[model samples]
Target: AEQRASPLTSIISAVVGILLVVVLGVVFGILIKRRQQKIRKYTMRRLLQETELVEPLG
Candidate 1:
């Protein structure tokens, strides 16, 4: 026969698991956002290179 874990221990385990999952989601979102920013900057540079420069306007 096996002994069961205490209820308090089970609750703590569940809370910790939830926190870990939340942290993972947040980190993934941040990484995806940074990737998009990099891509946007790259595309902008390409467009700027393809176009002619104009006089500065106020």
Candidate 2:
């Protein structure tokens, strides 16, 4: 005998699934921002290094 899930149970499951997706999306968004910041810092360092050996502009 197969027992079908109650409608309320299905609704709760759907809500939980949606929340999980939203939570993961937010987590990934923050992680991506941090990663971009790290890359930006790396790029800034390289740019500064390149300008370090500039010829005298007197």
Candidate 3:
């Protein structure tokens, strides 16, 4: 047998859980964005190198 939990406690628990989920989601999005930018920069550098090599031959 256990003491029953109050309704107010349940509501507070739900709100806290939602806030935690949102904060974690925002942090994860930032990490993914930084990784994407790094990849884009790498691709651009490769493209520039390829074009420069062709430009000198032509």
Would you list the clashing residue pairs of candidate 2?
none
Task: Give candidates' CA RMSD values in order.
Answer: 10.2, 10.3, 10.0
Give the alpha carbon lDDT tens digit for every residue of 1-58 in model 2.
6598589999999999999999999999999888778846878677777775885577
TM-score of 3: 0.55
Q: What lDDT is reached at residue 8 by model 3?
A: 93
Clashing pairs in 1: none
* lDDT digits (tens) for residues 1-58 of candidate 1: 6598589999999999999999999999999888778846878777776555664557
Q: Which candidate's TM-score is highest?
A: 3
Which portions of model 3 miss their true places by more than 4 Å?
Answer: 1-5, 39-58
lDDT of 3: 0.85
Residue pairs clashing in model 3 are none
Instruction: Give RMSD (Å) of candidate 1 vs. truth.
Output: 10.2
TM-scores, in order shown?
0.55, 0.54, 0.55
The per-model lDDT (C-alpha) reads 0.85, 0.85, 0.85
